[PDB]
Amino acid sequence: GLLNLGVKDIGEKVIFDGKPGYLGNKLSVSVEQVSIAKPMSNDAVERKVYPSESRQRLTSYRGKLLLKLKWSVNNGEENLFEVRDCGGLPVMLQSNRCHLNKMSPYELVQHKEESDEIGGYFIVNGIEKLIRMLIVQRRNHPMAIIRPSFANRGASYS
Amino acid sequence: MDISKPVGSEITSVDFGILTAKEIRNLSAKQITNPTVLDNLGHPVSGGLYDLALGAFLRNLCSTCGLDEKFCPGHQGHIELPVPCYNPLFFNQLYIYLRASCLFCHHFRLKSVEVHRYACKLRLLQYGLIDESYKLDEITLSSTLLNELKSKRSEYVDMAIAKALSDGRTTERGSFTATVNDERKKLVHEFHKKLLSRGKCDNCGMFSPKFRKDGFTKIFETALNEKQITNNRVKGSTYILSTEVKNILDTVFRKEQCVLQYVFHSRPNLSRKLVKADSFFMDVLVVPPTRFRLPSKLGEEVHENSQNQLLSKVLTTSLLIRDLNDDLSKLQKDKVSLEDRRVIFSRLMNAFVTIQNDVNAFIDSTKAQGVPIPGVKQALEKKEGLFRKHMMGKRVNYAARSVISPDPNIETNEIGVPPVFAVKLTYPEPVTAYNIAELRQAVINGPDKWPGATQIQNEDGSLVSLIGMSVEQRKALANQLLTPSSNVSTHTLNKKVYRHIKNRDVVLMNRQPTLHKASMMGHKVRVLPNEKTLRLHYANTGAYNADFDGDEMNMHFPQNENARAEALNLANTDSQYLTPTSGSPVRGLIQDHISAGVWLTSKDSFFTREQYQQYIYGCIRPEDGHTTRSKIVTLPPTIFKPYPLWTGKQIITTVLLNVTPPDMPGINLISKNKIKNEYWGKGSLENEVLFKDGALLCGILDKSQYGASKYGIVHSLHEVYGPEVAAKVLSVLGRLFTNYITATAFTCGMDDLRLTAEGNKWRTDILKTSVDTGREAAAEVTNLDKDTPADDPELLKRLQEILRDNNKSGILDAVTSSKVNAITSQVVSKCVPDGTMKKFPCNSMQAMALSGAKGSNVNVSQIMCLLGQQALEGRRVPVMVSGKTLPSFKPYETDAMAGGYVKGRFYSGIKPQEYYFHCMAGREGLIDTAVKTSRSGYLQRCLTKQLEGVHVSYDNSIRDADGTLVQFMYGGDAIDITKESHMTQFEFCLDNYYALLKKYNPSALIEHLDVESALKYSKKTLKYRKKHSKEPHYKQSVKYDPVLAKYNPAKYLGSVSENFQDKLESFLDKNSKGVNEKKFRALMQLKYMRSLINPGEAVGIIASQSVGEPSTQMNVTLGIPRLREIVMTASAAIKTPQMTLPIWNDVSDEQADTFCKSISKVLLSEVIDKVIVTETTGARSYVIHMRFFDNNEYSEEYDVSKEELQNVISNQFIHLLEAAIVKEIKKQKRVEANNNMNKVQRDRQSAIISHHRFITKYNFDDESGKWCEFKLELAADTEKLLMVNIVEEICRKSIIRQIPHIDRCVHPEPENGKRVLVTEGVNFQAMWDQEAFIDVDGITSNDVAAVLKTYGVEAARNTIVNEINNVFSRYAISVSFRHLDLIADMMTRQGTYLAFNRQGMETSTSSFMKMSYETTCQFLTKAVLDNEREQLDSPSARIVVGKLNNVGTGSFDVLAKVPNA
Amino acid sequence: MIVPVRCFSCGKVVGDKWESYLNLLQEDELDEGTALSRLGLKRYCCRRMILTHVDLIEKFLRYNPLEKR
DNA sequence: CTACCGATAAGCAGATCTCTCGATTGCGTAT
DNA sequence: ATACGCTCTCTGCTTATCGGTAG
RNA sequence: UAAAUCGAGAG
């Protein structure tokens, strides 16, 4: 996935002590893995929640975000680990982290959704939102640009 | 407003001033000390922002006046700021005054004599004696002579003032006009600039420290220099507190009171108040009443006011600094440690800066530091402020808004209102003796039964609501309507019934955007029973620009008789037949009625007696006042045998006969319609319309007859029978055509869009000839001979070269477009109407396209023949980098279709490539449509803001709001634009002589006129003008002025303009036709007397609208941007200046083509073929070889010979090259030519070496002039230089020959006969030399500022009119020269070239106008520092204070004639 | 949603001809035109009433709050 | 040689029709 | 559970500084 | 009862 690669590219961040030259203990803290659980509820054993509940409750259709830290000390001398929750992360319908992912149209009708319900949109506070696709420059291609504003970047600027 | 509550007082003028700290401490009811607004339990804490002494707050009685929240006006408090803080509004002028002051002697660094001179000049300008101000400067002839000079200057000023006051000119309060205001502003600017230019004081010559304002909230003064410190002995960085600045400026202002009395007062300071420097410091803030600081609430969400937050921050900082002051004060009695003093003083300084920043943030957000809360300034400045959002434009009561729907059976002056609006909207009718019949029934009917009543206003002001009442109670109340009052205090008053809107009420209908005044009319109300839409007649759609595509508009209900009469007489929709832009009509039947009348007035239209009579009664019902004779009079049938038949033209004839009033002749009109005689067969004359004696005898009634079109039947009826008759005729014709279409329907279908077999064959044969158009156009552009195959490698190479250039491909896309458009024109000429399967009038597509009902010829051409070339911003379809116009077209394909030529039609569809190109064109059209609306509003806003006060006065001259004269007579003839349509239609007026004589009626207009004097003067002037007027205009001595100058045209018959009189005489001479020329000339002169513009006309607003609204439809700059250059900016730096030069008939075109080459500039680069730089380092060497074109080439193209080029290189080019090289080094320190030379060349080389710096060789091709090689030595230490970009830059800027400010001359094709040279620069002085070729007396120029500079004011004004004229000539838009003349006269009223913007309006007597326009705070500061007093004369000024306008109905008063003394 | 009771243009009752139309199309291998003609729908105003009906109510009926699933 | 009069190169400001809906409204320590 | 500090302008004007005069 | 900002629309 992309979340793991991104959290890997984030890297590590360190900070030293104020007690003994040497600065103290490194504290190489970071995050190694991040996961999104399919949305669930506590009403004992967890039960699957479906977007019909999120729409009728006028609430969000959110799963659970679990980040596992790597609390390292002294350049890897001692490593502690913890799976910290990170609040309710909104999920969009008909995705691999949604409970309507591979449901047949019959099963979609059985769970009140639609005969041919399509996803691509999150539910936030009972309101359905989507994130618009943007047009941006093409990746990894150096394109020549003659732009007048470059001359405004300073004197002696073409 | 309540008409039964008169107000006895009136605000006449307002004046601006500083609110002194002493007065606010006295007016205040309480001061605030605790920056906590309300304590626990929600109660407002005493002494805080919400104090009961500042007003009633949330069901708490005000502690000041003892009144509850409804009746408490509110009271102002204050904040005792611990230190004086700078006023952010006045900070700039305070910083100006702080500099140029001498701390030692407490005077300005300028000498006292010059300061006294400026004071005397300003005092002279206070009384408008601008003449004497400059005569004061003519008094100049050690230490005692200056005192005598000052005494004599003061004596002269006093003598001038006393004489001017005694000589009936001025009163004690001075004369303040625009021009004297401009002179005062100029003098004060020169004064302030001169103060800033001093070295040391001229009364004690000691230097003073130089201040420096880093930003607001802090002023830093630099320390005096060592050398300057010495002078302070021989004559015997640092922060500065606010108190020190206050003390310095207080001392300076106390010393120089006599001089600042005339810098801070534009009028005689009668109060004699001293100008104090405390005015610039707000020692005490003023808190507004709590009524204006209330907290916002939404259910539970309660938020406090932002001004409260700012004031609380100020109070917190004040308490902090007060605590620091106390801490210092305790140590003042017993000092312990100076280090504690150090830290506490640093904290105190930080507190000073913090509280000053708090004040700045409270007043002006942009002056704060450290998105933020808006200040007081931010609440007034821009749109959404307080001037543009709550004073000039407000939200109103008794107004509805709804989506409109069409409705025939509405009288074309009426508005159909829904029952809901009829139930809600109400009018207060005072109960009278004649009214109780209807008002009693209205009260009984109640609020939910139209017509009804919703409220009763008793004499005392009680408002008894009828909503929650039963019928019996309503009868009890109705029986007590006209009961005489029991109270003496109200015995002069009667009750009012807030009755529902009725059928006799008027309503103001408006649809946004209101581009012109006709978009807001007055309609008579008719209430309909069914639906919730405002039903509107079709004729009103022309002015509102309204369709029925869900368009909505606003109905306003005037609530008094004064506004009733205006909407019924002035804003009346009958009065709005002709638009004031050009006098053309804007009312008439639009779409179905035009085709209906084309069918009905045809020759085939025969109607039996029943059909004829039913058609006549269907529109002329003689019980609604539709006819005059009380009995519908009919006509004998056209055909008597075999059975009686009438005709449609006879239907029109009897309609006119019934609507036209009796005791008056019928109309006589000879006109034309839009359908050619060839569309009716051979020998037809139905194209010419002929009304004779009120009977239609020939022609078809069309769009050009009824509709917004000039010189039709409806226009003639309006001119002859008046406006009400024309409106009635419009309504009757609408009903008639509606009833004819409901019995004889009109349809369009697929059969109308087809062509015959021969038509399709013609179209295919012509379009097959287009298979070679694109290739031939490309061959023409590429200069290949002809017949060259499309895949010719040279053709492809040159096509690729053409594509890469934006100019060559600009001519490729113009040449091919012309040929494909010619092919399109051939197709359209061949295939319509000949190739059509169905012919007019059966073909309804052509029937409604020819008649003007809807569509055009290009639309039916696209539908039936082809779409034609698709134009993208004047070019063809864009091209990719690869040279493909589309993926499906090979690169550089020489095809018309590839470039965007659609051969398909909407009948048979278009191919996907053609579909794509058409989508491009449609998208471009939509983008232009969206961007055009946004590009025109600002022009109209700028024009309306300044011209809103300009109006016609009772002197028949037009002048601004404050009285400044702009024109002496509207257009020079005082003729209304909306009443001069038929002034020169002399044959029309002759043919309808008796009809016009019935209305003008001289027999009743003789007791109140002078008839012979104006005629005699006109005869004298005409004789003299005929005797003269063969010589040039400057030679004509003006012995006799035109009659309009002397005799008032509205009071002396015969006093008319010279153009009208000359045209009348020419008409009366050319043709001689029981009407003789004497009676006809008398009738025409009376018509001219009645065609004059009324005093009080809002002429400036009308001119601004007539220049702005037509601007919606919109090598040299052309269009709206050109207007932006002229009106908005008054740019001396015109983007593309041009100059027109006449040509003597002696010169020939062979000389003309070469003369344009003897003036056009020639850069050195235009002849250089190439430049070769041979750099050999190890001193640096350079061989700057310049290879030219052949001598025969540039000696002919530019007429430049070898000698001139060589001299330019020797003198100009090398100097610039060396200068550039030295500059670059300075900024960076961080075939073989013959070697042998002759004798003279060596000496020339030596001279060139000597005159220049680092040249060691030089040579020029003195025999052929095709090369120039010279050396260039630099120091061996220097690093690498480009030495090619330097030469490229210099060569383009080196000049062979040029006339200054002129870059090119052209010889275009003569237009309108006269031969003209057009030049791309402006230099009159150089064209004055060429008398031989150019007629110097006729040099007119596009530049409207250079002509002002060299040819004075009036020539610039004429240029302004002509330039603002031809921008509308390109688009074929009719705007009268009367508007343009007024606009030009307003732009040049000061003798300069003023614009319509903030800088152009910088000088005006009305401060409110300039404040409301833009930059409110700067204008407010200028108005309050000058202590300006405005008389509330601008239209915008009276809105702020709420007074009746000075235009139209507010241009006079009304007096009652009480019979008993 | 459900078949209209009457044709809009003229008012002929066509709500009794929807199940019949479906049965005519289903059992008898008929085209739409012949099935409409057999039902007595002559004018095209009546023909497009049953020819173009979508019968969305069935899709509505599967969402039943009053019965368990 | 030095002080006044301009004469550009650079910096800075304000600015470029009405109407109808819905949705949100902040965090960061300190106690 | 809870209170108070915060990255593609048009027209000018206005400022700083550079040469020339003449004083 | 309020205000901005964002978003969506109508002429």
Ligand SMILES: [Zn+2]
């Ligand atoms: Zn009060």
Ligand SMILES: [Zn+2]
């Ligand atoms: Zn001094």
Ligand SMILES: [Zn+2]
């Ligand atoms: Zn039917």
